[PDB]
Design a protein around this ligand. Structure first.
Ligand SMILES: [Ca+2]
Ligand SMILES: [Ca+2]
Length: 116
């Protein structure tokens, strides 16, 4: 009963001026025990390392009966006019600290919409 872990949706649009994007990870079908869920950002046409966004990777620890957590990603606005750019987040194999598992949405494409 350890849970099935998922993003809300596989694609999201955010403004280049959003500042901080807050991405949710949901636990469904069971909330028993402490579970570690790895996550990471991956570049698309948007560049990481603090250029278009800040690299954000690590692990979420869900406590017993905890069913939602947040990954906060810094999205960096600029003064250039360009096309919309993309990056990704992924969640990795969950582990107890009966097994927890990944659910429907395990890769998320973020489309950063030019703010002008
Ligand atoms: Ca930029
Ligand atoms: Ca821009």
């Amino acid at each position: 009963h350890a849970g099935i872990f998922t993003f809300e949706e596989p694609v999201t649009h955010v403004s280049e001026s959003i500042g901080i994007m807050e991405v949710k990870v949901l636990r469904t079908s069971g909330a028993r025990g402490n579970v570690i869920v790895p996550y990471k950002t991956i570049e698309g046409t948007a560049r990481g390392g603090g250029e278009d966004f800040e690299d954000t990777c690590g692990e979420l620890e869900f406590q017993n009966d905890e069913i939602v957590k947040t990954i906060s990603v810094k999205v960096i606005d600029d003064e250039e006019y360009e096309k919309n750019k993309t990056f990704f987040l992924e969640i990795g194999e969950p582990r107890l600290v009966g097994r927890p598992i990944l659910g429907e949405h395990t890769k998320l494409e973020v489309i950063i919409e030019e703010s002008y």
